[PDB]
């Protein structure tokens, strides 16, 4: 067999003597077999089937609305067109984190009796000269798996979002110690690079650092999602 | 024809009282959301599809007119 061999075969010999009255009856019977599979098919095959059929009916409704609309009947420049993309902070009143969440304890000794060590459990930001401090003296631990050096921050305008390195953190509600520590819980306002969004004011030298508030717990996921305040 | 286990439909008093508590908290939360008309008129298919609005207009030519005088 070299090329389109089944098609050469179909044109030379044909199909089964009954491939037409089987296809026809299969079709006419699929209308019955759809309801059978909907009143049977227990347990997550029924969920997949129902969601799939909802998708289908949605698509068909989309299509027929579109066809009847087809039956009824800004101003970018040339160097640009045909290309496609109070003083209230958007987020006061975030929930409060007790000092038992976001502070885990680390008992020390084969006889676990002399703990004195704590471990931050929320995603932090550590800076640029982290360089972990000696084991005998360190009392707060922000483990390396929970660290961040950038944040995925969007813009109110331009309809954009970019990954920007986190320069430093300014305001962490519900503690000043959390701010000194650089813990990135939701609501915190971090000072992030903004070079790529490229803004110039009157005179407008150029800005390469801005303020932005985070809007998702970096624990229910790993990402940091923040939004800019133009 | 192997028959596989069927779920029991008994009580589980722990679960029954849990249902009471869940339902009550849900009602209260509903009342939180609670603290925060195109009347149908006339059904069709009626046989006396003539006399009705006629009687309403017989009323209205009086309810309007017994304001002025």
């Amino acid at each position: 067999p070299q090329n389109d061999y089944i098609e050469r075969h179909i044109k030379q010999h044909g199909k089964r003597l009954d491939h037409e009255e089987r296809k026809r009856k299969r079709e006419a019977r699929e209308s019955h077999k759809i309801s059978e599979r909907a009143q049977k098919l227990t347990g997550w095959k029924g969920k997949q089937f129902a969601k799939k059929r909802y998708a289908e009916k949605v698509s068909m409704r989309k299509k027929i609305k579109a066809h009847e609309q087809s039956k009824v009947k800004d101003a970018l420049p040339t160097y640009l067109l045909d290309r496609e993309q109070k003083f209230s902070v958007p987020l006061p009143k975030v929930r409060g984190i007790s000092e038992e969440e976001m502070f885990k304890v680390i008992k020390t000794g084969k006889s676990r009796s002399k703990s004195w060590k704590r471990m931050i459990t929320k995603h932090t930001f550590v800076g640029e000269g982290f360089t972990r401090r000696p084991v005998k003296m360190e009392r707060i631990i922000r483990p390396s798996a929970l660290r961040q050096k950038k944040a995925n921050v969007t813009h109110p305008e331009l309809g954009v979002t970019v990954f920007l390195p986190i320069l430093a953190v300014k305001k962490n509600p519900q503690s000043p110690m959390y701010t000194q520590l650089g813990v990135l819980t939701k609501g915190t306002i971090i000072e992030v690079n903004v070079s790529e969004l490229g803004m110039v004011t009157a005179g407008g030298k150029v800005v390469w650092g801005k303020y932005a508030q985070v809007t998702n717990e970096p624990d229910r996921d790993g990402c940091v999602n923040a939004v800019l305040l133009v | 024809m192997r028959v596989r286990k069927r779920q029991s439909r008994r009580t589980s008093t722990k679960l029954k009282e849990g249902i009471k508590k869940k339902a009550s908290a849900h009602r209260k939360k509903e009342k939180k959301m609670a603290k925060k008309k195109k009347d149908p008129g006339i059904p069709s298919n009626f046989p006396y599809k003539a006399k009705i609005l006629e009687e309403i207009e017989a009323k209205k030519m009086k309810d309007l007119e017994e304001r002025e005088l």
């Binding site: 209230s88 902070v89 000696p134 690079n193 903004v194 407008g204 390469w208 650092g209 | -």
Partner: protein, 206 residues
């Protein structure tokens, strides 16, 4: 978060003349092993960096021939790009291509080989589980523990084979994730290497 004029108060602007001033010493700055780096006083990379490349970034074709025109029953293309014209130059290409395929064929024929052994059917055994004594995660753990708890790192080589006991692939990570540690080298057990090689092996690595 109490309302403020910050937060909508811009923070970290920088000037034409500052970019002009500091884009200027990158092709100058006097760095030797007799001077190490301590601080940063961070400066805007995305603007101060990025020397020129003259390589013609690879063209893109996606937005011009999607997929269903490329191949498939749609196949909205029949004639090639760039539709070679010079027949003599083309047969030049194709004959030199077969001969050069023969050149690579003889590269592999000379170097190897394993095809005769795999036609005999046998294969080399399992390299022992002892030959994984340094590449355990229990070990690389403590490794990064000291990389992170260290203010600087000393990568001890041995004098008799530095080129074989470096095998770095860790300095690539170090320079980029924590540049402020400078990877001193000590070529240990030197005496087993005479003073002559004790100079040769440092002269081209310092």
């Amino acid at each position: 978060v109490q309302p403020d004029r910050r937060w909508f108060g811009n923070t970290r602007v920088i000037s034409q003349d500052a970019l002009q001033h500091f884009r200027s010493a990158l092709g100058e700055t006097q760095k030797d092993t007799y001077q190490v780096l301590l601080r940063r006083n961070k400066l805007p990379m995305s603007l101060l960096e990025e020397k020129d490349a003259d390589e013609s970034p690879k063209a893109r074709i996606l937005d011009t021939e999607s997929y269903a025109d490329a191949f498939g029953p749609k196949a909205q293309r029949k004639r090639p790009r760039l539709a070679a014209s010079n027949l003599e130059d083309l047969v030049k290409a194709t004959n030199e291509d077969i001969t050069k395929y023969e050149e690579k064929q003889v590269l592999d024929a000379t170097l190897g080989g394993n095809q005769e052994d795999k036609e005999n059917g046998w294969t080399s055994a399992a390299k022992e589980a002892i030959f994984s004594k340094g590449q355990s995660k229990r070990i690389w753990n403590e490794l990064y523990k000291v990389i992170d708890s260290s203010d600087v790192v000393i990568h001890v080589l041995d004098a008799r084979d530095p080129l074989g006991t470096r095998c770095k692939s860790v300095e690539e990570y170090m320079k980029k994730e924590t540049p402020h540690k400078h990877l001193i080298y000590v070529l240990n057990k030197c005496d087993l290497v005479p003073t002559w090689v004790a100079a040769a092996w440092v002269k081209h690595l310092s």
